[PDB]
Design an enzyme around this catalytic site. Structure first.
Site: not given
Ligand code: TFK
Ligand code: NA
Length: 240
Positions: A188-189, A69, A45, A61, A93, A59, A64, A186
């Site tokens: 995520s991944g 990096e 995602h 900061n 995912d 990385e 800065q 942020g």
């Molecule tokens: C990532 O940093 C974050 N992930 C998401 O926001 C992924 N995400 C969700 O957490 C949900 N939650 S829900 O609605 O409760 N579903 C069970 C829905 C959608 C998404 C999502 C899907 C596709 C693209 C982006 C987000 C963190 C919270 C881990 C980030 F922001 F996605 F990159």
């Molecule tokens: Na930096």
């Protein structure tokens, strides 16, 4: 990461910052784990749009210039074939990004160690989530790499009615849910580092949290279970 603390400058060398180019500027969007000198593992995602991406290793900061990096472009993106753009709940995912150039390993840049296929952690296993994601629900990105202690919640409890129910699958790992610490936008991944046999191994790729809030009690952060994808990962890498 909500409820975390700034990590030490060389604590999690496999953590990377996945950034996309907006105009002329770059902006952090997700985390990831360096698994080969030219391969990064992240969440599907994060690399679902036709965006121009780059990976930043060593990385600490975001703002800065730390002086450690290495910025490399993304050459190839392989999202899991069963990944459905909508569906964070359906699973799959996970994505692998082939880097345009191999990075140099040193103390700030190291490869993450992957678990043996099928490995499932016991309930309450010690793990840490790392990232520059929001430090508060609807807050802002962390300038410096944050870390939080997030022990596992085994599938039986996590898939129960009062936690995630059927939303969480066996190919996912749940961690946290104490209402104070969690992943957030942020993150995520990024990696879920778990201590196994005296070694920190990357057991999860940060996937989702409750859209009602990042640190929601009984709504632990959910990650893609890496050990369920070992064969896929090796096949992809062997093939390109
Ligand atoms: C990532 O940093 C974050 N992930 C998401 O926001 C992924 N995400 C969700 O957490 C949900 N939650 S829900 O609605 O409760 N579903 C069970 C829905 C959608 C998404 C999502 C899907 C596709 C693209 C982006 C987000 C963190 C919270 C881990 C980030 F922001 F996605 F990159
Ligand atoms: Na930096």
């Amino acid at each position: 990461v909500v409820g975390g603390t700034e990590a030490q400058r060389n604590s999690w060398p496999s953590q990377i910052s996945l950034q996309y180019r907006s105009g002329s500027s770059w902006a952090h969007t997700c985390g990831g784990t360096l698994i080969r000198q030219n391969w990064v593992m992240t969440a599907a995602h994060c690399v679902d749009r036709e965006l121009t991406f780059r990976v930043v290793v060593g990385e600490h900061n975001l703002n800065q210039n730390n002086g450690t990096e290495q910025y490399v472009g993304v050459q190839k993106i392989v999202v899991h074939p069963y990944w459905n753009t909508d569906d964070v709940a359906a699973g799959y995912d996970i994505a692998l990004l082939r880097l345009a150039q191999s990075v140099t390993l040193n103390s700030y840049v190291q490869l993450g160690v992957l678990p043996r296929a099928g490995t499932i952690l016991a309930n309450n296993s010690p793990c840490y989530i790392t990232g520059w994601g929001l430090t508060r629900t609807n807050g802002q990105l962390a300038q410096t790499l944050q870390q939080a202690y997030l022990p596992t919640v085994d599938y039986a409890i996590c898939s129960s009615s009062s936690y995630w129910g059927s939303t969480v699958k066996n190919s996912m790992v749940c961690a946290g849910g104490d209402g104070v610490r969690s992943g957030c936008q942020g993150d995520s991944g990024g990696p879920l580092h778990c201590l196994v046999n005296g070694q920190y191994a990357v057991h999860g790729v940060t996937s989702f949290v409750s859209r009602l809030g990042c640190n929601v009690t009984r709504k632990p952060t959910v990650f893609t279970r890496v050990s369920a994808y070992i064969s896929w990962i090796n096949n992809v890498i062997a093939s390109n």
